[PDB]
Amino acid sequence: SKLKPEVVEELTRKTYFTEKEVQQWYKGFIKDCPSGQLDAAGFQKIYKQFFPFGDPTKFATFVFNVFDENKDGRIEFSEFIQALSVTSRGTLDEKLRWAFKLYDLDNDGYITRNEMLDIVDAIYQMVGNTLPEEENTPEKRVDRIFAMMDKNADGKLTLQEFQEGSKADPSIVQALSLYDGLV
């Protein structure tokens, strides 16, 4: 199955991929999702493929919701390739804007402790028996992040607090500096 020329052209101009790369990703996408419409269950499936033994089910749902840009309940190829482009090849600022969207569950422009607790709980569930005290619970992790990033101590992180606090921490910068998962 191949992408219509005018479609690959558009997706090439909107992502950090070449035309060949867009075509290769379309083929992988379809081999796995012949309908071209990825549902949350088949998304959760794929994360298990990458992260067996743990329980990525909740984290996969949160990630699915960011991929599902128009909030229609399915991931189509245009959403898939754009989310891949930013998460794997975006600049630091673009990656941090995308991560903010992940944590901001209700899309109101802030990340609250509870929202972040929900995501970090979900991450801890995914990894699990795959840590130091001071960071052995999602609660301790969220406390550390808010200590570092919540500059006006109001229990919320704005985009700018999240971006600057992330750029201050070398481990985070290291995680966001990957290109295709390689630095």
Say if residue 95 carries a ligand binding annotation. no
- Note whether 160 binds Ca ion by CB under 5 A: no
> Which whole-number Å values give the CA distances from 43 to 23, 51, 85, 93, in the listed order?
21, 12, 17, 26
With binding defined as CB under 5 A, does residue 37 bind Ca ion?
no
Determine if 104 is a binding residue for Ca ion (CB under 5 A): yes
Task: Look at residue 104 and give the partner it binds from Na ion, Ca ion, none, a contact being a CB closer than 5 to 8 Å depending on partner kind.
Answer: Ca ion
180 labelled binding-site residue = no
Residue 64 and residue 80: Cα distance in Å, rounded?
Answer: 10
SS3 76: strand
Q: Is 70 annotated as a binding residue?
A: yes
Determine, following the binding rule CB under 5 A, whether residue 6 of this chain makes contact with Ca ion: no
What are the residues whose beta carbons fall under 8 Å from the beta carbon of 74, sequence distance 6 or more?
37, 38, 39, 68
Q: How far is the CB of 169 from Na ion (least distance, A)?
A: 31
Binding site for Ca ion (CB under 5 A): 68, 70, 72, 74, 104, 106, 108, 110, 150, 152, 154, 156
Binding site for Na ion (CB under 5 A): 12
